[PDB]
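retry 2 of 3: previous attempt timed out while embedding chloride ion. Reduced batch size to 1 and resubmitted. Inputs unchanged:
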Amino acid sequence: CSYTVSRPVYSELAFQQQRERRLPERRTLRDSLARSCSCSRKRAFGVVKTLLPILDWLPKYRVKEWLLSDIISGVSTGLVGTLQGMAYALLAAVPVQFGLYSAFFPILTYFVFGTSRHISVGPFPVVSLMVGSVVLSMAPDDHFLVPSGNGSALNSTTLDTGTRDAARVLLASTLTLLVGIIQLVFGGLQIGFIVRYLADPLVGGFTTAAAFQVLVSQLKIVLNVSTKNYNGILSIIYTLIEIFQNIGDTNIADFIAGLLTIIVCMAVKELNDRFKHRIPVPIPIEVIVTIIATAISYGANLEKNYNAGIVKSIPSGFLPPVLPSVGLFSDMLAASFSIAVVAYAIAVSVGKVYATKHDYVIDGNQEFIAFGISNVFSGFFSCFVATTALSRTAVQESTGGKTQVAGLISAVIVMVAIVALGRLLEPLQKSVLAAVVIANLKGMFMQVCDVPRLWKQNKTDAVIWVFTCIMSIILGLDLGLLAGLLFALLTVVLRVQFPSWNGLGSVPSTDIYKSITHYKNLEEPEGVKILRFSSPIFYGNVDGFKKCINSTVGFDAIRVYNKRLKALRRIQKLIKKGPKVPIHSLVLDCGAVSFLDVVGVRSLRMIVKEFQRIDVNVYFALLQDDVLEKMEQCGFFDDNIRKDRFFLTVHDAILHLQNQVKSRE
Amino acid sequence: CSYTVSRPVYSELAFQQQRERRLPERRTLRDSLARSCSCSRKRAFGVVKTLLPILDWLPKYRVKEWLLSDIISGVSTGLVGTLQGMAYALLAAVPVQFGLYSAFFPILTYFVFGTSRHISVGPFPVVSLMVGSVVLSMAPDDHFLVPSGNGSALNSTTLDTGTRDAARVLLASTLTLLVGIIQLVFGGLQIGFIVRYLADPLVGGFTTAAAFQVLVSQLKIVLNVSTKNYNGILSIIYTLIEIFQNIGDTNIADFIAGLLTIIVCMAVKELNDRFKHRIPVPIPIEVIVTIIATAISYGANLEKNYNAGIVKSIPSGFLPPVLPSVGLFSDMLAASFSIAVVAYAIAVSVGKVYATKHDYVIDGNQEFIAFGISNVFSGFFSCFVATTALSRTAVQESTGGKTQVAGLISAVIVMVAIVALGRLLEPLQKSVLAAVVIANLKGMFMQVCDVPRLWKQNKTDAVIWVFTCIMSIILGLDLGLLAGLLFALLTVVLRVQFPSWNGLGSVPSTDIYKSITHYKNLEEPEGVKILRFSSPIFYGNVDGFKKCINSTVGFDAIRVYNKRLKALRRIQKLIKKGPKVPIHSLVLDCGAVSFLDVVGVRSLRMIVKEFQRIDVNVYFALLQDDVLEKMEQCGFFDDNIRKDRFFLTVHDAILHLQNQVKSRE
Ligand SMILES: [Cl-]
Ligand SMILES: [Cl-]
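retry 2 succeeded.
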C-alpha cells in the first residue's frame, strides 16, 4: 500500500556504532575434527543406510502387486537389455558375449549400492562408442597381421581373427577398471560439483556429435565395409570419406535387410509414441524384429548363398575372472576420466528425470559410489563401462516398475541368455543389431531442434551448444568434451569480465534508481554522477571498470590532472616574470559485487586517490558487509579514506551530497 | 540529515505502466559499417598520429634543455645497454656477438612506432631465458657432435665449436619473427584484453620462479661446468643436481672472480639505493666492474695459465640480413605465445610505473604494434625477443630522461660497440657477465616477501602466487605460465560458483536489511524468510542455489511435497473404508546477479513451481532491469508467474506481505 520510512542518513559509521555485531565462531580445529567424527551409533546407522540403500526399500515392500509388476518389467527389460548389449558389443569392438556379460554383472552390483528405483543399468551407445574409439586408438588392426597362409607373392598377412579379441577384451577391462577407480575416487572424496560444469547445451552438443559418430559407425557396420580404423583428428570425416569411396564393396542383402528393419522399427516406434492413448505398454518392436530376423536368416543360408555377415561366434557360457592388466592407466587416464564423467552425468540426468516423475529423491555421491563399484566389479569379469540407456530405462517405467527388483529380474533373462539361450541367435545378421542402435538415435538427433530456441534465448548458451557439437567432431569425441568444459568456463569468465554497466538516475519524488538507457523521464542530481557496475571487480575487469568510469564521467582522471599541471607551471612563472566542470561527485552503485580480488581493491584505492586530486568525491552506495570486511583487510581504509565515504543505500549518498551542498556552498 | 520518502509500493507493474521506456537504437548493419569507416580527413590524421607517435613529441621538443639531459643519459645507458645486451645473450644460448644486435636494431624500430618516452627497449633476463629454453630443446648439444679428430678408441666425437651456433642463431631468428607476428596480431585485431589475465600474483609468482631458473642457469657459467641440457619436466631440478655432482670439475679462477664481483656489485647497488639523498645519479657499478675485469684479465693470461673461461669470439662486425627459416612456426607456436605475452606484460608494467610518475598516458594497443614491428625487424638481423629491463630503464630516468632521444643516443654507443669497440672485451671472463645478471635478480628475489602479506589479504590471490611459482618450476617455465593463467581463471569460476549467501533480516523501525550472521538485534518478519544470493546463477552454481534455499528455510520443497502425497493417499482411502510450518513466504534478494544462463533460469521457474504446490510464495527483491528483460526472453513469465511476483526493493516485498495478510487472513 504505502511505502513510507523515516530514519537518519546512516552512511557507514552512523549505522555501525549503535549496531552491535555478532562474535564470529571460534575455529578450534581440534574440536572441529572431534565433533565431525561422531561416536554415537546414530551416525553409524545413518552412514550404513546411506552407503547401502538396499535396506530401505526392501522392508517396506508391497509384494501383492509389486511382484507381478516387477516380474513383467523384469522379463521385458531383460529382453531389451540383452538385445541392446549384443548390439552395443559391436560399438566397443568386443565380441558379442562380452556385451551380455556387461549387461549382467553391473545389474547385480547395482542392487546393494544403488539409491534409485527406476534405473536399468547396462550398456550405452555413447559410452560403448567411446570405449571402442579408445580401444581402436590404443590397439589398432594393423598391429596384429601375422604372416601365414602361403599367399600369392608376399607373405600371407591375412586377418588375425582370434587372439586379437582377447587383447581388445583385456584393454576394455583395464579401461573399465580405471573408470571405476576414478568414479570411486570422485565419490569417496565427496567431490560432486565437478559434474556441474556439464551444462545443458554442452551435453546436448556432445550427445549430438556422439549420435552422429554412432550413426557413422553403424552405417559402416551395415554396409559391411572394412575401413582403416581412422582415429585422432577428423576421424569421423575420414571414415565417412572412406565409406563413400568404398561403396562398391558393399553387401546388397545386408543393406536391404538393414534399411527394411530401420524403416519398420522407426515406423513402429513413431506409431507407438504418437498413438499412446490406445496402447499404454510400449510394444517391444526390438524383440519381435530380432526374432523374425533370426528366423528368416536361419531358413535360407544367407552366410553361404548371399555371403551375409552373421555373428556365429557365441560361446554360450561363462568364464573365470581374469585379473586386469594394470599398467595402461597413464596413457588412458584422460579417456577414462571423460568416460566416467559422461556416464555419471547421463546417469544423474536419467535418475533426476525418473525421480521427479515419480516424486522421490536420489543422492548423487551414492550413485557415484554405486557406479564406481559396478565398473570395478565389471572390470574383473571382462566387461565395459556400464550406464543407463534412456530407451531401456523407459521400459520398466512404462510397463510398471516400483523398486530394483524388476532390475534384478532383468538379469535373470540375461543369465539364461548367457548359458543356454543364444544358440538361435547364431545366424543373426550384424546389420540387424546395428539398426536398432540407429533407431534409438532419434532421441539425440532431434536435439538439434533447440538451437533456434536457444538463439532467441540466452545467446551465449547457444554458442556453447554449437561449439561443443563441432569441436567434438573435429578432434575426436573424448577430447571434444574437454574443449567444451573449458569453453563453457571461458564463456562464464567473459560474462563476468564484460559486465552490463548503466547510467543510473533518480526517479522524481521517489527513492528508486533505474538505468538511464532504459527509461526516459529520469532526473539525475545536479553535478552528481551515479554509476552501477555488476560482475564484481577482479584482476580481469579492472581496465573495463576504468573505461566504464571514464565513459560515465565524460573525461579521464589522468589527462585532466596532466592538463592542470601543464597549466599550473604557467602560473608559477608569471609571478617570476612580472574538463571536470559538470562532475561534482561520483556515486558508485557497487551493489552487485561479491568478491573484491585485492588486485582490484588497489585499483579502487588508486581511483579514489586520482579523483580526490581533481576534487571529485567517489562515494559508494550498496557495498555489502562481507565485501567491506574484505576491503578492510586488504588495506583500503587509511587515515584519509574513512568509512564515511561509504553509504548504505543509493539515495543516502545523494541526500548527503545535497545536504553538504546546501550547508556548504 | 533526514531520509524520508513517501511512495506507493510499486512492485514491478505498478512502476512499469506510467514509466515510458526508451526505444532501443536501431541496428542497421548497413549503416553501422558505413558510419564506422569515416571518410573525413580527421579520421586519416587520427590513425596516423596514433600508429606513429613520433610525430607528436618531436615537433614540440625542448632542444635547449632536453638535448642536454638526453646526451648524458644516452651515453650512460649505452654503456649499461651494451653490457646487459651481451650478458643476456648467454641465457639465449646464442654467441655474445648477437647480444649487441638485439640492443641496437630494436631501438631503431621502437623510435617511430613507440608511444612511450622513458622505456629502453632491449634484452631481458626472463625473456631471454624463455628464448634459450626452447633452443636447447629444439637444438640440443648431442645433435651436432661430428666424429673427427682421431680419438683414442672410438670415433673422436668432440665438441662442435664453430657452425654449431648457426643452428641456434637461425632458430632464434625464427622464434623472434613468430613472437613479433603474434604481437602484431594482438595489435592488428585490436585484442588487448588477453593480457589482463596476468594478475599481479600471477606475474609476481612467475617472475619470482623465473629468477630461480636464471640463478641456476647463470650459476653454471660461474662454476664453468657442462651439464646435459636437461629440458622438459623438472628441468631446473635435474640441472641443479648435476651441478652438485660436478662440483669437482669447477674452476677456481672463475669462481673466485665470479663471487668477488657478486659481492661488489650487490654492495654498491644496495649502498647507492639506500643513501640516495647524497648522490642522485646512480653510479654505473655494472660498467666500472666490467672495465676493471677486462684489465686484470688482459694483464695475466687467465686463459692459458689459469684456464679461465673467456669469450675470445667477437668478430667486431656486422652481417647482411638473413631471411628467417620459415617452417618452424608449427612446433614453436605454443612456445611463442608464452614469450609474446610476457614481453608485452613487462613492457606495460614497467611503462605504466614511469608513466604515472611523469604524468603521461601510454597507449595500450600501440605497444603491441611497436614491439611487434621491433621483433619482426629484429628477426631479419639475427636477434631475439626485445623487452624493457627495469634496471636499464631506471638509468635513463634517474639520470634525466624526457623522450626517446636518450634511447637513440644509447644505440649510438651500441653502434660503435659493434664496428670499432669490442676488441678490448676479448679477454672478458664469462663469469663476470653471468654475475651482473645475478645481481639484478635481487628485485625479483625480494618478491617472496609479499606472500605473508597476501595471506592476510585475499587468500585466493595468495594461492595463485604460490601455485604459479611452483608450477613454473616443475613443468618448464613457459608451460608454467599457461598453468597459471588457467588456474587464475579457474579461481574466478570457483568464487562465482560458491558465493557468500546470508540470512538477511530487517532492522527495526527502518528499511535497511543486513545479514543475520553479522548483526544480533535484527528482527525478521513473522513467517517471511529472506535470502540473498550473490554470484549470479549459472549452470555451475544452480545446484548450490537449491541447497542454499533448503538451508535458509529449514526443509526441502521436494521431500515435504512427497510426504504430503504420502499423507494424502491415507485421506482418499478413509472415505472408502468408512514441515512447512514457519515458512510463509520466501523473498529472494537477488540484487547481486548480473547474467542468467538460461540453463540456470529454468530452475528459477522450477523453484517457484516447487514452492507454489506447498503454498509458499517465492518473491524477488532487487532484480535488475537488464536481468528482468532476460527472463522474459528465456520463457519465464507464463500465465501463472506474472510480474507482480517481482519487486523493486527488499522492503516492498515485505510491506506487500504485511498488507496482504492483514487484508486477507
Ligand atoms: Cl538409448
Ligand atoms: Cl633487470
